[PDB]
């Protein structure tokens, strides 16, 4: 048997058979560097 089978997505198919785009975001944290930080908020500057 061929390992690869075509999905054959069609709009007329049901919700369970409609195409769904899936992205897995793995936040790997190797024990030395840090390159992906969060864009956290910055407030106003008040003096005196």
């Amino acid at each position: 048997y061929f390992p690869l089978q075509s999905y054959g997505f069609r709009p007329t198919y049901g919700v369970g058979h409609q195409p769904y785009r899936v992205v897995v975001l793995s936040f790997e944290l190797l024990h030395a560097p840090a390159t992906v930080c969060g864009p956290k908020k910055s407030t106003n500057l008040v003096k005196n």
Binding site: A32, P33, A34, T35
Partner: protein, 48 residues
Amino acid sequence: IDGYFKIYSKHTPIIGRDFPQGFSALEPLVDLPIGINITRFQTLLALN
């Protein structure tokens, strides 16, 4: 240091011919989180 490659540099004019007698500290120029093993290095020359 700690996976950080730090490069400091300075551009001193020469008062004389070679190795002027004076003091000029090296300002930090770049810090790079490359985090790789460094044990040797080589320079590149330009040939005309």
